[PDB]
Write a protein that binds this ligand. Structure first.
Ligand code: CTP
Ligand SMILES: OC[C@H]1O[C@@](CO)(O[C@H]2O[C@H](CO)[C@@H](O)[C@H](O)[C@H]2O)[C@@H](O)[C@@H]1O
Length: 578
DNA sequence: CCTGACTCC
DNA sequence: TGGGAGTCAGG
């Protein structure tokens, strides 16, 4: 494959359509080096040294010109790496990573060669083959690097039309061009902005937490009558089931289980299990949300810059890494205080948080077209209280707080394909009763039962299920003769349209919201998405406007057979936005 | 490296 | 024997 290893940018490199590679080899692309650039267009194939091209005013103009269209793979990686150099990338019209992901998330496409494999294109090597793995990873010599980047650009160039044609075939071209590609740009902005962190506060928390871990630890050794590694399920298992001879409720492939559920169930036998559960909660706060977080905060700006993986989950959700900012504690007050350390990036700005209320159950109502469930939402009746009345067969007055929490377990459990066994184990109740709860649920919401049956039938017939905005998931195990393998696929068939349609909706909301913020020239901007909620920061002056704009945009992103409902709060820290 | 903890939706 | 994720310590 012929290409020019160029020493300067020329006009023919700047055509109004091109495949572009802006190579960042570090997995975490924030403030990462760009090791090489390739361009393929109608006029030829070119390799450019970053030091050259990125200092060349014409090439920089071209990159930032939205009418000069680029086809790329993982344009967010390039856009963010470029942002860290103060260079704007616009005009990305095709992203091969996002296209491959929409066509089949199960393939786990993470490099151009893997995408190319989908169309039997083989004139390009896998990245791991060129760079090496683990401790062996290195940028090769220029001629080897140059050929690799050009081959990746040539592949994107040849593969664009084939991928667009299949997407169009699948009714997924708009999903790519109108949803995922614009979202990619919004996520790039979010990641690059980062979130500001009050490190003094975390370090203090860590100091205090270290004291308490030592206290709990020593008390556990007292109760056990022995020292051991409490963070070793293997050692813990010997203490519990051999030394203290507590009952063995469950084994894993490797040995005795010490899961939270098992330890909870052992509480009537020995008090130490409650101490141990507490110790492990504290240890995770320390290791992950104090120490782990502080490791990744940029010391001069005190910001953390997550990476949202847009092409990973099997249902269309994002994930968040290094650090994961989608699993910051909230359920326990001690852990929830971590959120006091997430603060606005400017003086006199505030954090604004908006969350969909029960979006999965509303989506289930919509998709199952169950009159009873639809009506409950149409009238905004508390769905957990409703399900309690049905599964316990009582009037609204007689529903105790605990009955509501059990009904809640049923409501989400049904959405996740739970069995009477799992429900009984989760609520620690009789399995006979758990079975009754489920039978009563289905008797009360017959449309949901028909949905579960129908969607499993559809998956068997088509080989995949689909979401509201035409995302798909293939389920080749759905007709397996093996009960376990088939059962798992059946649960995926039932859950994916629900979870994935919810993901579709919040993504569209993010796009609609950014349009409105820019439309109104507000300084407010998105910081995070946490599956069913959006977190922003803005000047304190803008709260009044956001209180109106943010929920309206989120609620109206799509129109279902039931309303969508959005709650929202704001305050001086993420913790206080409640 | 994998497993089994913890955390979130 | 409930869906979708990431990180950490221990082994
Ligand atoms: N028994 C339960 C309860 C909750 N969840 C989950 O944890 C998430 C958050 O649940 P939650 O906040 O409690 O939902 P709400 O309906 O809003 O509860 P509530 O009305 O009391 O505020 C859910 O999306 C679901 O993934 C679950 O898996 N099993
Ligand atoms: O850049 C995000 C994009 O890159 C991929 C590889 O193509 O994932 C890589 O980067 C992730 C973010 O740092 C890492 O978590 C990872 O392990 C690495 O392979 C895609 O999966 C992702 O969408």
């Amino acid at each position: 494959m012929a290409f020019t290893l160029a020493d300067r940018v020329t006009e023919e490199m700047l055509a109004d359509k091109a495949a572009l590679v802006v190579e960042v080899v570090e997995e975490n692309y924030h403030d990462a080096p760009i090791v090489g650039i390739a361009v393929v267009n109608e006029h030829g194939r070119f390799f450019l040294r970053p030091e050259t091209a990125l200092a060349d005013p014409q090439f920089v103009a071209w990159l930032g010109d939205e009418t000069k269209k680029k086809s790329m793979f993982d344009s967010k990686r390039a856009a963010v790496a470029l942002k860290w150099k103060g260079i704007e990338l616009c005009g990305v019209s095709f992203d091969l990573l996002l296209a491959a992901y929409l066509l089949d998330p199960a393939q786990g496409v993470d490099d151009v060669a893997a995408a190319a494999k989908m169309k039997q294109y083989e004139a390009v090597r896998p990245d791991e083959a060129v760079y090496g793995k683990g401790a062996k990873r290195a940028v090769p010599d220029e001629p080897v690097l140059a050929e690799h980047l050009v081959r990746k650009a040539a592949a994107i160039w040849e593969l664009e039309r084939p991928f667009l044609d299949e997407l169009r075939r699948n009714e997924q071209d708009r999903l790519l061009v109108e949803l995922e590609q614009p979202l990619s740009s919004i996520l790039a902005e979010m990641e690059f902005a980062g979130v500001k962190v009050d490190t003094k506060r975390l370090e203090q928390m860590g100091k205090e937490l270290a004291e308490q871990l030592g206290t709990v630890e020593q008390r556990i050794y007292e109760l056990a009558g022995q020292e051991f590694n409490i963070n070793s399920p293997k050692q813990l298992g010997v203490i519990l089931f051999e030394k203290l001879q507590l009952p063995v409720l469950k084994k894993t492939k490797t040995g005795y289980s010490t899961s939270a559920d098992v330890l909870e169930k052992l509480a009537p036998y020995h008090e130490i299990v409650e101490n141990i559960l507490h110790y492990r909660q504290l240890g995770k706060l320390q290791s992950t949300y104090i120490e782990g977080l502080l490791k990744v905060v940029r010391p001069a700006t005190k910001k953390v810059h997550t990476i949202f993986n847009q092409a990973l989950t099997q249902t269309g959700r994002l994930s968040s890494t290094e650090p994961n900012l989608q699993n910051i504690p909230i359920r326990l007050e001690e852990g929830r205080k971590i959120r006091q350390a997430f603060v606005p990036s400017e003086s006199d700005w505030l954090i604004f948080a908006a969350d969909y209320s029960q979006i999965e159950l509303r989506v289930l109502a919509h998709i199952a077209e169950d009159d009873n469930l639809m009506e409950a939402f149409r009238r905004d009746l508390d769905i957990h209280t409703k399900t309690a009345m049905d599964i316990f067969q009582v009037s609204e007055d007689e529903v105790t707080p605990n009955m509501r929490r059990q009904a809640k377990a049923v409501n989400y459990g049904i959405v996740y394909g739970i069995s009477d066994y799992g429900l009984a184990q989760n609520l620690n109740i009789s399995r006979k009763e758990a079975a009754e709860f489920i039978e009563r649920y289905f008797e009360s919401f017959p449309g949901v039962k028909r949905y579960m049956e129908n969607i499993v039938q559809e998956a068997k017939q088509k080989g995949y299920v689909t979401t509201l905005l035409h995302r798909r998931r293939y389920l080749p195990d759905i007709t397996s003769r093996n009960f376990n393998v088939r059962s798992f696929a059946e649960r995926m068939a039932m859950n994916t349209p629900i979870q994935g349609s919810a993901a579709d909706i919040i993504k569209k909301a993010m796009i609609d919201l950014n349009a409105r913020l820019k439309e109104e020239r507000l300084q407010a901007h998105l910081l995070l998405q946490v599956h069913d909620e959006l977190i922003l920061e803005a000047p304190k002056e803008e709260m009044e406007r956001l209180c109106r704009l943010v929920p309206e945009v989120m609620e109206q992103a799509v129109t279902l057979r039931v309303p969508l409902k959005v709650d929202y709060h704001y305050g001086s820290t993420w913790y206080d936005a409640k």
